[PDB]
Design a protein around this ligand. Structure first.
Ligand SMILES: Nc1ncnc2c1ncn2[C@@H]1O[C@H](COP(=O)(O)OP(=O)(O)O)[C@@H](O)[C@H]1O
Ligand SMILES: Nc1ncnc2c1ncn2[C@@H]1O[C@H](COP(=O)(O)OP(=O)(O)O)[C@@H](O)[C@H]1O
Ligand SMILES: Nc1ncnc2c1ncn2[C@@H]1O[C@H](COP(=O)(O)OP(=O)(O)O)[C@@H](O)[C@H]1O
Ligand SMILES: Nc1ncnc2c1ncn2[C@@H]1O[C@H](COP(=O)(O)OP(=O)(O)O)[C@@H](O)[C@H]1O
Ligand SMILES: Nc1ncnc2c1ncn2[C@@H]1O[C@H](COP(=O)(O)OP(=O)(O)O)[C@@H](O)[C@H]1O
Ligand SMILES: Nc1ncnc2c1ncn2[C@@H]1O[C@H](COP(=O)(O)OP(=O)(O)O)[C@@H](O)[C@H]1O
Ligand SMILES: Nc1ncnc2c1ncn2[C@@H]1O[C@H](COP(=O)(O)OP(=O)(O)O)[C@@H](O)[C@H]1O
Lengths: 247, 248, 243, 248, 248, 248, 247
């Protein structure tokens, strides 16, 4: 039950419905805390392979050394800390969608490998000899500006274009004020039920504030700001009171 | 007897703790050295649902940056010359209970990440390989530095900030909680006057005003030590500008 | 269908029935691979395997390693012997994409093989023997690198025997439109779209557009159009905006 | 055999040492390289309520920085390297007794931090261990460097000092306690005389003076050292400028 | 195979390569990339008292510095390689044989020295070892650099230089051996015309002259190839300015 | 063999030696390069209560700083990077005898520090060991730098200098002992005249004046060599102004 | 038949003869290939222990971190792999002449430890505990200027001077013209016999050329450049033309 009631969002939602029934890689960009994952997540549930696996893996939480192998996999002989070939996530999510967060953290080496896989659907295991071919619906995401990284020499130009087929720009909460009040209201519901609190909703005075806050964290920060406000809540409503504590 | 909270902003912070009771979202505590951060964590946990459960407090500074990512989590055998057994973890020891990471800013980028992954997934692996353990530990970070700043310095992962920034408590230095200095004074005095066996009863309007004026840069940490001293050299029941001045 | 590619299809044809290395120069996306991939199909060995490896998808140091194989502990971390991608491609054809990334050593080793067929698994004492069809394809200006001492002179020359310079799409106008269709046909065919073709309206911005990304960017831009396509045709609208 | 406390300050200190011994907070001893800082500590122990309990004393610079925390708190099976046995770390070795940490300023911020915790909690985890060890250690801190200076350079944990600077004892150099120079000189004279089997009964006043006109950059240490040197080169029953002048 | 030594100097070199045939004194060969050094080495081998013996030939440039010494001198167990049992090395491989070092210039310094010994004593130390390995190797080396300036530049050990150089052979470039050009040219053509099965027989005075003219900076190597190309793009029975110009 | 002390200060030392050879305190022999600094400690041995005990003489500079602590105090088991067995530190070697550290100038601030302990407590720990070994070694510290300076620079623990200073003993260059110079010059010419079987008995009057002028910066040693050469190129029964000239 | 028929050379030959009878260190300087090792070798053939072992050893071709251990030997445990206890070349050379060549390479700690041997004649087997005592006649040599080095702080001093005692300076052949022509004939004669060649000598034309060459490779270039000429030799002699190809 995810929210979509703003401008550029009820539009993106469409773009999702139209895309899903595709098989080319989608690229998602935006500031951390806008939906990227969610969006990617949906682009899956609607996709013709919704029932298929959704291997969503973070690129910033993984040692570069592990990742490159964690993803494509290895073969006895390239890893001196493990002997036995484990299938990379690619083979794991065979026929499924593979979402990589913060793409902008892929090795100039990983990226290359990636490209070859987006197009041929083929690749070699790390230290592999047999060409493994699979069926993965890649879903890039990132908070960083690729085009800027492309010039810095920190990212493959030809990898970007191939992902730029379907690109989705997620604008920050601060530019979807039509989302703050609905989302917030989502959250206030989640938590009010999660911590068994008789909290029904925000007051006008409060609703205003929520709309004025810049929400740097965006959707994320609001998620927290309200779990926090739900707990701090004393009566049935929330206004300038608990909120100001934060926002 | 009891503990000490009486100034408005703290009269408050106690409650915030009380409300947070029924929760488990990580908590980010911040105040100058000595302000009572680690005293709040401890209280948050005494109040959380898992009070009876363990409290695994670990100073992130009390361990060389190169061995933190070996003791917090754990260690998979033969990955570093000499391993008597894949190393357990403070995370694993704190499983089911609280894990109070003190002085967060002192986390290596590598672990800052590795923590994030465990704050969301809750699963972790000791070194290279995969997760094979289940840990249910409530994160409680406390730092005396300003997190936000560190974020523009790149020394602190932002996403890890907002993740711990679910509930955020900020302890104001003693010098702003003046209503606390005095009451916090007799608590201590009374404490050592016991442990140390001195007929000390209290302070003199003389000294009190002194205390209530001193800035206490190691707020409360200082106030505790200062007074532990002032009691040791006590002859008369009361303590005045005399025993404090030559010290403060 | 072109002023230079309808010609190249002949050099390829007049070559395939050969056995020496074929350099393939041109910007990113012209078809450097396709050509080679092709060159193979027409080669006396097209029935053999076509090992295709992206020089830059494997860490510099760890290359000669892979590409030429090593024995047991011939170095840092090598548990058990391995086969050089070359060997894998014995009899078949090897395609080294972006020859520009080969360490001055890899080059050094490459050459010797291309000139003797014999080499030494990295850290090996028996000389292995092979017959492989080398298909090099960079997008850089080797001749420069050579000067900047960033590439071996002699290596170039030996590869430069059969050089096939693929000009961009901004120099093959003849190919912009025929291709654009080829993509629309397949993309329409795949994404259940009732699209027939372009309107001279879009066929204009098309043949005009710089196409720095070459045939690839196109094979992309189109797929984007075929998706964001509505009716049966496309025009300045779809093509403009996101492109 | 005995001890020399005949100046104004020392005999004053020999009295604060008494008022303390019957306590248990950490005491920080400052003073140049020779004022007999250890001694003053060992004495506060021979008057303390655990005087029969052990007196663990270690030289903070006699163990490489890296092994220290490990040594000071111990470890078990495993650790970054070479750790293969359990060493209950010095601390425990003195549980109930007294720990003399020689020249603090050499501690690593890690150790400083880890220590500061033990001082207050009295509990700590073996490096690489999983059990919360508890001990009742009397920590006596001594250093020849100026801590406060160090705090500025950020070469020393602030709050650690405040935690040790409870009981601070400033032991001046010899060249400021003159009153002891001769009483002392005698003491060493008696001793080394006995020790080396000599007929040395005193110093001429020719010498009695050299000894007062020396800065003794090695307060007491250098004294004791000079004298013994003398008593050996001595010939008569009295030692005068003649023998000393070679040295002092 | 037929060797094209039909020039005034090359015809002379060959004699040298012959007069030199009866010894084992190291040989240093110098010339541009492709004037056929390895050839002249190979030939030096084929005419040497140890022709029916090995001829190991590695290209210093082909081996990354990380592994070369180890690749050339082998290593002993527990070598600086983090691997088990001892690997022999190209030197031993060439035992009794003739080792050919191509492009001597890239030889590391520590390397050149080691090499310097083997040339004298015939002994060397498996990387990270102790036993002293002896080998009866004939050394033929060559490079496309002018040594002296590397000796001067202090990039190439001096003494070393004066050690191989017992016998030195200068292989001029093609541009100074026009007498080889044409003959070479044919042999190549005859060789390719066959291998590829064509009807082409020779070159026209038209082209013959272009060939004699061209500078040939890729030396013989480019020749063999430029022609292999022609023989490829050959239609008629004779190759003339027509094809030769479409390239060179 | 033959001692040589006819000179005011030498002769005085020789006595300082003797008065000392009845004590087990640390003798900090001071002095230039080749002023007999060794002989002196060898002598302070031949006359000590343990002249029969071992005289362990180890050059604190012929042993690399990292392995120093190793060989000195000793090692336990696989403690450091390259440990295979339980080996005995040098101290132990000389247990009941004398450990003569030639030039404590080069002592890792750790060694120095770790050296102190041994000096006083007579006990020490084997690097990486748990047991506290104890020995009674007579330490003969022979530097040749100005310790006091090093102490300033910080390059020498201050309390170490004071623990070896108990009997400092300067040693005057040869330029400040013209008395020995010619005796020595003779004590040698003899030996070497014998050893090399030369019919040379002594120097001319001319000669000896030089042997007096010359400032022998290389001192006694300096002389020894220089006479040996002389004795060797010697012709007549006399070595005159000449022989000692073109070499001085 | 070793050559010594010129001024400074016939002179040094007299210094060698007197020396030999003497077990003292002897330093040897000169450019690469003047005869240092030859001299070092003669000082031994003439010493009162010529019948003894002459441990010549190349310092540069020996892993710096093994030298000492090689030199002084080691006792078990000395390092990982120290199974038994080997005994350095010193004990190898005992009773005779060891000969470090190019001294300037010893490590500081090496030069130190080296020293005490010169004086005491004792040294400690790496990680050893007993004093090993040998009777070796060190015969250092070098090509670098030690003096200059000491300054830089690369080479201990005492060791410098300790060896300085009898220092021998071999002069470049570019100053021993009198030796040239003689060396040549001895050389030609040699190879001319090793390869069964009809060579008898050189022509005035040749000779003059010789004596005109700087011989940067001093005596050790002349040795090659004659083996070369002796081979390429056609008739009975050798003139400008054959040596010009080299010189
Ligand atoms: N559009 C949305 N509607 C409701 N909740 C959302 C929405 N977007 C994000 N969230 C919530 O906010 C958090 C931010 O999630 P995420 O998708 O990972 O952000 P990002 O854009 O950085 O990838 C999620 O845990 C999710 O539950
Ligand atoms: N509000 C308080 N009431 C009573 N004691 C307190 C209070 N705050 C701090 N203290 C005392 O002050 C000391 C400093 O505690 P701590 O919170 O751990 O420091 P920090 O805030 O830097 O982590 C504790 O030993 C505790 O007993
Ligand atoms: N001549 C062509 N005909 C049809 N499609 C082409 C042609 N040339 C290139 N393409 C398309 O453009 C892409 C360029 O591919 P590739 O072989 O990798 O060339 P390059 O190595 O120059 O980038 C291919 O995926 C292919 O579908
Ligand atoms: N007041 C004193 N009376 C007798 N001896 C003393 C006195 N003070 C110091 N000493 C002696 O002086 C030397 C200095 O000792 P120490 O306590 O270790 O000083 P510090 O720790 O300041 O360097 C010791 O031998 C000690 O026993
Ligand atoms: N004299 C010659 N006769 C016939 N072929 C030659 C001759 N010289 C060189 N070649 C050929 O020319 C190419 C250049 O070879 P190579 O000996 O490796 O040159 P270089 O060592 O100078 O780099 C080789 O393929 C070789 O077979
Ligand atoms: N007093 C002396 N009488 C005879 N020989 C001496 C005397 N003092 C020193 N020597 C000789 O001088 C040399 C220098 O010896 P040493 O004591 O080791 O110098 P230092 O220890 O100062 O560096 C030795 O050969 C030693 O035998
Ligand atoms: N005086 C000489 N008499 C005969 N041969 C000599 C003489 N000097 C040098 N040589 C020869 O020249 C070569 C150079 O020898 P060497 O002394 O080792 O040079 P370096 O000065 O570098 O040590 C030797 O192999 C030797 O045969």
């Amino acid at each position: 039950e995810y929210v979509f009631e703003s401008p550029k969002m009820k539009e993106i939602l469409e773009k999702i419905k139209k895309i899903s029934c595709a098989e080319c890689p989608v690229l998602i960009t935006g500031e951390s805390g806008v939906g990227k994952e969610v969006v990617a997540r949906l682009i899956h549930k609607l996709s013709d392979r919704s029932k298929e696996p959704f291997v969503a893996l973070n690129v910033a939480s993984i040692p570069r050394d592990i990742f490159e192998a964690e993803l494509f996999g290895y073969e006895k002989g390239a890893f001196t800390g493990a002997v036995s070939s484990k299938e990379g996530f690619f083979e794991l999510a065979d026929g499924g969608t593979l979402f990589l967060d913060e793409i902008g953290e892929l090795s100039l080496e990983a990226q290359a490998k990636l490209l070859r896989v987006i197009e041929s659907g083929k690749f070699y295991r790390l230290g592999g000899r047999k060409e493994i071919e699979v069926n993965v619906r890649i879903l890039a995401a990132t908070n960083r500006n690729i085009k800027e990284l492309v010039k810095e020499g920190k990212f493959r130009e030809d990898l970007y274009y191939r992902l730029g087929v379907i690109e989705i720009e997620i604008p920050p909460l601060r530019e979807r004020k039509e989302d703050i009040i609905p989302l917030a209201n989502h959250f206030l519901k989640k938590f009010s039920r999660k911590y068994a609190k008789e909290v029904e909703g925000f007051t006008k005075s409060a609703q205003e504030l929520l709309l004025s806050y810049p929400w740097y964290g965006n959707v994320r920060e609001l998620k927290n700001v309200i779990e926090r406000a739900v707990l701090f809540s004393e009566g049935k409503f929330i206004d300038r009171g608990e909120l100001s504590c934060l926002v």
